[PDB]
Design a protein around this nucleic acid. Structure first.
Ligand SMILES: [K+]
Ligand SMILES: [K+]
Ligand SMILES: [K+]
Ligand SMILES: [K+]
Ligand SMILES: [K+]
Ligand SMILES: [K+]
Ligand SMILES: [K+]
Ligand SMILES: [Mg+2]
Ligand SMILES: [Mg+2]
Ligand SMILES: [Mg+2]
Ligand SMILES: [Mg+2]
Ligand SMILES: [Mg+2]
Ligand SMILES: [Mg+2]
Ligand SMILES: [Mg+2]
Ligand SMILES: [Mg+2]
Ligand SMILES: [Mg+2]
Ligand SMILES: [Mg+2]
Ligand SMILES: [Mg+2]
Ligand SMILES: [Mg+2]
Ligand SMILES: [Mg+2]
Ligand SMILES: [Mg+2]
Ligand SMILES: [Mg+2]
Ligand SMILES: [Mg+2]
Ligand SMILES: [Mg+2]
Ligand SMILES: [Mg+2]
Ligand SMILES: [Mg+2]
Ligand SMILES: [Mg+2]
Ligand SMILES: [Mg+2]
Lengths: 313, 88, 132, 128, 101, 512, 49, 65, 196
RNA sequence: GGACCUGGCGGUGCUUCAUAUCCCUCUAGAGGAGCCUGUUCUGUAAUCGAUAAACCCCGAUCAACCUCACCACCUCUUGCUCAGCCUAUAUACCGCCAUCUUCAGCAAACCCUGAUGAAGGCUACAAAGUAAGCGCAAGUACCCACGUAAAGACGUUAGGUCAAGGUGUAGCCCAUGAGGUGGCAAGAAAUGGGCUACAUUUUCUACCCCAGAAAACUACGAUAGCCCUUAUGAAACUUAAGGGUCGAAGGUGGAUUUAGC
């Protein structure tokens, strides 16, 4: 399905007329009608619940919709425009030629936030199909260019093939410190373990009292291991007997409830400890939601993993 | 129409069931199906019967295909005259 | 190997529509439902009766517009209204399409005791999604 | 039952048995295969056994500037229609059996010596 | 014009069971208590046993309405698993999809 | 919501292949759809057992089969009444004869109910799904036979005989029967008098003064018998005076003034008959001018209800005079009355709707500014009606007078979309205007793209079965437009067609 | 009501308003079996007599 | 629908036949799927059934009319 | 020559037209009538979502073209004449409870099909607070025992649910009858009550 | 007969690996007892199909009548059907599947190599391959980007199913079709899967984890046997539930073997 320039030009004329129609339908100014408004209006007028968004109704600009097509690479006389046409990879080899030429001129003269573009992004800048070894050879040639004393002209070029990657900080978020009617500072957080959901209120000052659904923690958790879980966050930061806690937990069993409270208390306790202590709690596994939940049973087998006995042959 | 309306989304219901995959034997091979029922609850308050008739007729006629509606109406009534005082 | 509702690969010469090209696991993901009614929602009744009616209308329209249907029917129910939306070809004369619309809407309205409307969308040829 | 009926494509795909373990490795010594016949070929929408004339479907809608009314062909007039359809059908069968004679090569069953015609014209309007 | 003779027998059983439902309900009420005399209940036992055999509702079988398959039927749609899947797998059953989770 | 001007009427399928492209297809597509409905109803009523399962709640009485056969097979009075309700003329007569021979008593009310059926249909069976000029009252008919055999005859028995005779054009017999009714000291009703007024005028051909003296005698008789006239009495007088024209112009206006006084309110039919009576061939300015101006001042801003069968003819008649008078302000008042409330439903059948809009639009193009004319062109066509080829010409003549010829290529595009691709009078008109004078290069190029498409229309006519016919003017214009556009190659090729068809070349073409 | 559906659509086929591809398929197979000699016998005149 | 004791006037006022019919009417008073006409039919059926069984009931010391 | 399809009438639509006149009521998607270059369909490799012409996926959608914000606002301007004004005195729920102590709950079910019947629609629920009723110490105690679990001590609300009659109006009148006989029996004092 | 090509196979080589996976290792089981259930045999006048992996609580998310297709007896003949057939053929097929697959390959159309043979087509500091499409992948569902589902081509086993339904061919048509009544569906024996056990990490009771008792011929241990009651039903020694009585084998199971990251 090749698409000519005349075909795309007609598709853009339709999109601009339809863009004004869509704005007229919704009673909005056609001049200030953006692509975000188009998507909102199309989702209302043509509601689709299909799980894959690519299968849903779309009214995008032709440039966004249609794929990139290389233009004709020769004229009426049949002479190709580019001197590397007969390689079949004129854009790739023209780039290798340009990078190789810069490496030569340097000799005559003489990380965290960025990555190399992937093969599928190079294959779009060039508008050609590339092998994996072609991609490697090009990257090996760019790396060889950074190690050299590349100037400003040789730095704008390398940055074209570098894509900024947004590292996400692992630093734990801190809850706001609130104040009650009596003026006592406290923090509040939540935790989930299996099907248990907990919400804990940790007071800045206290004597070590913990109330779980209004009950003393040792009466609510008669099993000693459930109480060790409540001790774990405070003990790890040397704050046993320094805070009062009132928490509520629902769902799950006794152990899942102790785990949900442990996570809720640890997150809320992060408001009253130093930043270095919060990173130690994170590295100790006290601030991570356990993703381990029951696996579904599959049909045709006894359990989530166990298979029916392989019958004796 | 000047009606006070609040909206919330009750939790969805997914009914799953299993069927044999083959026409004959091969019990351990099944095909599983589900029906997803999603909910939206519009809560209107302090409206007269005449206003409720127009609004419900307007939105019931425009109920999309595949969408069912359960409208629960809470009517305000005064005490029956017999109950106002004990006969005894 | 799974067979259900799968048009199998060939030599690249078999035209399939969008409906035909998607196996059942794509239902509700890439393809929608061909009939929409409330019978299969939680707490709703008469799913069996809606299913029988749908099977009939599909067979009925196949034989009432023989060789004219270019895709599956889309069945819509709103209240007691029944809407039949069909993509048809442009071979039969328009007089015959008006005869069959009047005939089908009337006959189906008396059969199922509900107002039935038939909406025809004409295409020059069967719309091809891909060649398997 | 009306609901147990299938389409012609399903009926021919089954009846023909073109796909199957027998076709896989030519497992059967078979010669004359059943051939699918299109049963809607000579069929006119609106024509039925009873011979009714539906205005706008199988007969003209207007006759002499007035809308025609529902009518039915006479028993005699309908017999002719059926016979004419059988003769039309027999012609379709007869002609298909009739074949043009292949010029033979070195022997009657051999491919050697048979002409295949000129080579196909090349993509750039080249001809042979 | 029913799918088979077995569906036709069930059709008749459902029709006769409908005709005798009230009579059987009334007679059974006399048999399903400890209030009335045994002499009266013993006569009611004979009366309900003398009714036609195909008036008994336990003989009704839920068969597939399109294929008459006596087992593997889903009550909500009255279809066999094979017929149900055919319609479900072609997207012709409103709201029904393959389940993955 | 208002009418969608880009769409054809709602009754048609909203599809470019199924939308009607002409007034002929507009009429025939609806007839084909109605034919399909009749075939469905024929099957539903022929095989009712297939359509008897009622799954609808609440019950829909109008979606059940109809049973047109009598279900009482006993011979008695209560079984005859059934065949009269079903309007079985033959079965009811046979049942009445057998019932009479047996000697059983048949009530009077039922005997009258049998005459109302025979007298209305003329002893003939009403039309069914499947089993003009002249008098249709036969000399010996079941109605007269039953009437004579009748033992006791009341007022209603005579009245249904007098009305039925006039309905079937037995004008002379109905007057003879009206004499017996008076000899028997009986009193007729208003409906009988309405029929007798129709008979007095149509019985014999006489001068107006003779006819106008009899009618006034019937009306005075109607006052002697304490019978009050209804609307149809006055509408029949005006409908019957149409023949006399000029002689009845002042007498007809005396009826209208009487209606207002008595208290009867003139309907749309009352003015249609006055409009047609005054709109005789001739110079309408003398009288017709002030009759239509006074009729509209009265009807201004009035919502109308159906009272007479001829109410759906006023708008067609009123527009016809506005075109004749060439008064566009009056035409807007007529159309304004059609647009007030629900008055649009009185336009009439499809033939009356197309005539009304043809005269209305043809008057706009003539007497209205071209900028407004092109707004009505968009509002009316194809939304309200499909234009006849003579209105496309009237539209081009308006563009010429306005010196707006850049629209000609649009009129040709629309003309094809309305079924006028192969009209000779139209293609000749378009080509002559385009090639009448030279224009700037931008316009001249546009005229050559249209002439080319017209040339294709001449080449691919449905008359291609016959030898192709190219008018002399068409060939000269098409060639001239190519030269003036610079497509000289196309012009030189066409010169062969002057010799092939033996068409004289125009002097201007040779010089260019 | 399988009687209603089957009888209705059979009637519509004889009226020319419904094309039953399945029935046409069966009618063609039955036609070719006559030419092949495999015709249904008359009741009482079966191969066993 | 809910008060059906007016229809038991033909039955005995005490004994097993009264106790049994109070259960029948109790169940009929809780049935929203039956019209009043249909509920009376049930009661009338028992009234006739017990009349035909008078001899059997007399043997058990029960007097139905 | 065969019949040539006309061009779509979207090409005649102005960008400042009254769209509610094009789609006045719910109707299936019509490519020839919707002047939008909307596409739908999971695209093939190096392909695009299918165009609207002959697009079954767009036909399957319950579109809202007849309910544009412009249309809704015009529709509601015409529907204001049908509405009545809520009493200003009833500003809060607590004020409603004072003047109207009884609450009647009913449910209507809108489904698609030929039959509008639904057996769940007959149910009526009557809720009242015993504080609203004129009950003395003896009557309030007896009423709570008679109703049993229908009364909730936390809320002090008596809930009478009636669904034994075929119709809703019958189930409503029965709920009021129950409230009336419960109220009057609560005020009556029998001799066996002395044995409490 | 000579020499080759391709494929298969080798108690075939080298190298590298498997990840609940081949060995060793880890945990709980099966194989021993009773019982439940399937199958095979035997039996019966008394179905059918699956039946190495890939059959064996399999078609059945289900057989007291019905279901039912079986047997015996009796009855009907244009027959619920513009008839019918669970009659043969899954080695004629559609349909829906098993299986490798816990795979990653299949392949149109070209081009080139081999003297223009069957055939073959790669080396990245590259030497003849270019490859649409399909699958994998990617996306989507479920709680994430993880996992689990889903997906999984072309082919393989004439694999399974004519008894889901439909259907080619052949066959039956006073019967190989239709209906009714009643009846079979057992256990010498063997075997697969499961259940409960053999107990002290236990048994009973309270409680739902700070207790008191029990603990070897009145212990642990039957969901079995026998009796009774109840539930469903028109119909129950028969199906289910409960109670009473009874208190057996079993004392942790050989070779071998299943599952799980
Ligand atoms: K080898
Ligand atoms: K073991
Ligand atoms: K075992
Ligand atoms: K197969
Ligand atoms: K089969
Ligand atoms: K077969
Ligand atoms: K023991
Ligand atoms: Mg486990
Ligand atoms: Mg599988
Ligand atoms: Mg042979
Ligand atoms: Mg030879
Ligand atoms: Mg059963
Ligand atoms: Mg293992
Ligand atoms: Mg064992
Ligand atoms: Mg077996
Ligand atoms: Mg076998
Ligand atoms: Mg087998
Ligand atoms: Mg039996
Ligand atoms: Mg049995
Ligand atoms: Mg048999
Ligand atoms: Mg096989
Ligand atoms: Mg994933
Ligand atoms: Mg899987
Ligand atoms: Mg995948
Ligand atoms: Mg085999
Ligand atoms: Mg037999
Ligand atoms: Mg026991
Ligand atoms: Mg019992």
């Amino acid at each position: 399905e090749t698409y000519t320039e005349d075909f795309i030009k007609k598709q853009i004329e339709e999109f601009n007329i339809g863009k004004r129609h869509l704005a007229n339908m919704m009673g909005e100014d056609p001049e200030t009608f953006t692509q975000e408004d188009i998507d909102r209006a199309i989702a209302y007028l043509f509601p689709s619940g299909l799980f894959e968004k690519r299968a849903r109704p779309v009214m995008k600009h032709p440039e966004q919709i249609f794929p990139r097509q290389r233009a004709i690479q020769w004229g009426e006389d049949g002479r190709p425009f580019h001197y590397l046409f007969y390689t079949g990879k004129q854009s790739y080899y023209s780039l290798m030629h340009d990078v190789y030429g810069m490496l030569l001129n340097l000799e005559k003269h003489q990380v965290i936030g960025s990555r190399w573009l992937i093969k599928e992004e190079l294959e779009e800048m060039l508008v050609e199909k590339l092998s994996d070894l072609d991609y490697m050879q090009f990257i090996r040639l760019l790396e060889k260019l950074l190690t050299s004393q590349c100037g400003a002209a040789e730095e704008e070029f390398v940055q074209r093939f570098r894509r900024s990657v947004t590292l996400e900080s692992k630093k734990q978020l801190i809850e706001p410190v609130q104040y009650d009617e009596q003026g006592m500072a406290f923090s509040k957080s939540e935790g989930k373990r299996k099907t248990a959901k907990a919400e804990a209120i940790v007071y800045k000052h206290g004597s070590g009292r913990i109330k779980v659904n209004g009950i003393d923690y040792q009466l609510y958790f008669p099993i000693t291991q459930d109480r060790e879980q409540l001790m774990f966050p405070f003990h790890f930061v040397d704050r046993l007997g320094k805070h009062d806690v009132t928490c509520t937990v629902s769902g799950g069993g006794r152990s899942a409830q102790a785990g949900a409270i442990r996570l809720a208390m640890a997150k809320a306790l992060c408001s009253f400890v130093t930043e270095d202590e919060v990173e130690w709690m994170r590295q100790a596994g006290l601030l991570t939601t356990d993703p381990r939940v029951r696996e579904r049973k599959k049909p045709g087998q006894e359990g989530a993993r166990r298979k029916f006995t392989w019958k004796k042959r | 129409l000047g009606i006070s309306i609040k909206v919330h989304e009750p939790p969805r219901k997914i009914e799953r069931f299993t069927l044999l995959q083959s026409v004959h034997i091969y019990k351990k091979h099944r095909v599983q199906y589900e029906m997803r029922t999603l909910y939206r609850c519009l809560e209107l308050e302090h409206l007269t019967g005449s206003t409720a008739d127009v609004y419900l007729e307007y939105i019931q006629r425009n109920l999309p295909e595949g969408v069912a509606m359960e409208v629960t109406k809470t009517q305000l009534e005064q005490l029956p005259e017999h109950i106002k005082e004990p006969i005894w | 190997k799974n067979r259900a509702a799968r048009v199998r690969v060939s030599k690249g010469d078999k035209p399939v529509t969008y409906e035909e090209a998607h196996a059942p696991h794509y239902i509700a993901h890439r393809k929608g439902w061909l009939s929409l009614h409330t019978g299969n929602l939680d707490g709703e009744d008469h799913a069996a009766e809606r299913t029988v009616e749908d099977v009939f209308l599909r067979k009925f329209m196949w034989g009432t517009f023989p060789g004219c249907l270019a895709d599956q029917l889309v069945l819509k129910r709103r209240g007691n209204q029944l809407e039949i939306c069909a993509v048809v070809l442009r071979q039969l004369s328009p007089h015959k399409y008006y005869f069959l619309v009047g005939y089908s809407e009337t006959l189906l309205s008396y059969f199922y005791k509900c107002p039935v409307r038939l909406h025809l969308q004409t295409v020059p040829s069967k719309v091809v999604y891909k060649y398997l | 039952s009306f609901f147990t009926k299938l389409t012609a494509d399903e009926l021919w795909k089954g009846a023909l048995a073109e796909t199957g373990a027998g076709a896989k490795k030519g497992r059967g010594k078979r010669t004359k295969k059943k051939k699918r016949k299109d049963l809607n070929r000579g069929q006119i929408i609106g024509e039925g056994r009873y011979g009714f004339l539906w205005p706008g479907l199988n007969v003209p809608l207007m006759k002499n500037g007035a809308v025609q009314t529902i009518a039915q062909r006479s028993k005699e007039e309908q017999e002719k229609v059926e016979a004419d359809m059988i003769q039309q059908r027999e012609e379709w069968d007869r002609k298909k059996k009739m074949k043009v004679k292949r010029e033979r090569g070195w022997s009657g069953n051999s491919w050697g010596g048979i002409s295949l015609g000129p080579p196909d014209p090349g993509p750039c309007g080249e001809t042979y | 014009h029913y799918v088979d003779w077995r569906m036709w027998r069930d059709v008749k059983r459902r029709k006769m069971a409908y005709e005798y439902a009230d009579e059987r309900l009334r007679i059974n009420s006399l048999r399903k208590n400890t209030i009335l005399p045994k002499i009266l209940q013993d006569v009611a036992d004979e009366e309900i046993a003398a009714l036609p055999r195909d008036s008994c509702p336990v003989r009704i079988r839920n068969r597939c309405v399109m294929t008459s398959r006596p087992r593997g039927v889903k009550r909500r749609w009255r279809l066999s698993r094979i017929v149900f899947r055919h319609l479900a797998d072609h997207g012709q059953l409103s709201g029904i999809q393959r389940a993955t989770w | 919501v208002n009418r969608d001007t880009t769409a054809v009427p709602y009754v048609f399928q909203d599809d470019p292949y199924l939308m009607p492209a002409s007034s002929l297809e507009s009429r025939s597509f609806l007839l084909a759809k109605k034919s399909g409905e009749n075939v469905a109803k024929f099957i539903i009523n022929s095989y009712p057992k297939y359509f008897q399962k009622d799954i609808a709640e609440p019950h829909i009485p109008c979606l059940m089969p109809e049973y047109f056969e009598p279900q009482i097979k006993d011979i008695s009075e209560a079984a005859l009444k059934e065949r009269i309700e079903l309007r079985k003329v033959k079965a009811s007569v046979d049942m009445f004869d057998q019932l009479l021979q047996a000697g059983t008593t048949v009530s009077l009310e039922t005997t009258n109910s049998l005459l109302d059926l025979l007298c209305y249909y003329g002893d003939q069976e009403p039309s069914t799904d499947y089993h003009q000029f002249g008098v249709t009252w036969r000399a010996k008919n079941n109605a007269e036979r039953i009437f004579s055999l009748m033992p006791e005859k009341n007022e209603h028995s005579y009245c249904t005989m007098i009305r039925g005779m006039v309905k079937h054009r037995a004008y002379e017999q109905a007057l003879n029967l009206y004499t017996e009714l008076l000899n028997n000291r009986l009193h007729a009703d208003v409906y009988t008098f309405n029929a007798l007024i129709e008979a007095t005028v149509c019985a014999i051909n006489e001068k107006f003064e003779e006819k106008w003296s009899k009618i006034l005698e019937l009306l005075r008789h109607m006052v002697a018998q304490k019978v009050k006239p209804n609307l149809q009495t006055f509408n029949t007088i005006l409908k019957c005076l149409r023949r006399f024209h000029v002689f009845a112009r002042s007498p007809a206006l005396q009826v209208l003034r009487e209606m207002k006084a008595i208290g009867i309110e003139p309907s749309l039919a009352t003015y249609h008959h006055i409009i047609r009576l005054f709109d005789q061939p001739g110079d309408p300015l003398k009288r017709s001018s002030f009759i239509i101006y006074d009729i509209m001042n009265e009807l201004m801003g009035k919502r109308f209800s159906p009272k007479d069968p001829d109410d759906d003819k006023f708008f067609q008649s009123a527009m016809s005079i506005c075109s004749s008078l060439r008064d566009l302000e009056l035409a807007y008042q007529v159309h304004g009355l059609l647009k007030t409330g629900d008055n649009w439903k009185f336009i009439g059948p499809d033939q009356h709707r197309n005539f009304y809009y043809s005269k209305f639009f043809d008057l706009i193009c003539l007497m209205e500014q071209i900028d407004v004319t092109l707004k009505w062109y968009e509002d009316l066509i194809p939304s309200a009606y499909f234009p006849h080829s003579q209105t496309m010409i009237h539209l081009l003549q308006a563009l010429d007078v306005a010196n707006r010829l850049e629209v000609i290529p649009k009129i040709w595009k629309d003309s094809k979309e309305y079924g006028h691709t192969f009209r000779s009078d139209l293609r000749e008109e378009i080509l002559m205007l385009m090639a009448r004078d030279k224009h700037p290069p931008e316009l001249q190029v546009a005229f050559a793209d249209c002439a080319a498409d017209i040339k294709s229309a001449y080449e691919s006519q449905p008359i291609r079965q016959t030898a192709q016919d190219w008018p002399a003017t068409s060939l000269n214009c098409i060639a001239i437009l190519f030269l003036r556009a610079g497509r000289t190659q196309e012009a030189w090729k066409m010169l062969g067609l002057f010799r092939k068809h033996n068409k004289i070349p125009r002097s201007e073409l040779l010089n260019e | 009501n399988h009687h209603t559906y089957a009888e209705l659509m059979q009637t519509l086929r004889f009226l020319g308003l419904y094309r039953d591809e399945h029935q046409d398929f069966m009618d063609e197979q039955k036609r070719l079996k006559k030419l092949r000699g495999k015709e249904k016998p008359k009741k009482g005149e079966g191969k066993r007599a | 629908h809910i008060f059906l004791e007016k229809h038991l006037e033909s039955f005995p006022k005490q004994g097993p036949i009264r106790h049994f019919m109070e259960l029948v009417t109790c169940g009929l008073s809780k049935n929203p799927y039956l019209s009043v006409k249909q509920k009376v039919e049930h009661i009338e059926w028992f009234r006739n059934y017990f009349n035909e069984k008078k001899d059997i009931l007399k043997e058990s010391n029960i007097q139905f009319n | 020559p065969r019949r040539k399809a006309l061009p779509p009438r979207t090409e005649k639509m102005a960008v400042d037209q009254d769209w509610p006149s094009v789609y006045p009521v719910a109707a299936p998607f019509k490519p020839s009538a919707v002047p939008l270059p909307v596409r739908m369909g999971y695209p093939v490799k190096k392909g695009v979502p299918m165009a609207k012409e002959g697009n079954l996926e767009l036909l399957k959608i319950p579109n809202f073209l007849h309910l544009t914000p412009v249309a809704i606002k015009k529709h509601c301007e015409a529907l204001k004449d049908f509405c009545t004004e809520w009493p200003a005195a009833l500003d809060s729920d607590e004020k409603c409870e004072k003047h109207f102590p009884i609450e009647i709950d009913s449910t209507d079910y809108v489904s698609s099909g030929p039959s509008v019947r639904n057996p769940r629609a007959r149910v009526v629920v009557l809720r009242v607070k015993l504080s609203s009723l004129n009950l003395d110490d003896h009557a309030k105690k007896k009423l709570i025992k008679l109703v049993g679990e229908r009364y909730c001590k936390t809320t002090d609300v008596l809930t009478i649910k009636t669904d034994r009659c075929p119709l809703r109006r019958q189930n409503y009148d029965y709920a009021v009858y129950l409230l009336t006989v419960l109220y009057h029996e609560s005020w009556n004092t029998e001799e066996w009550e002395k044995s409490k």
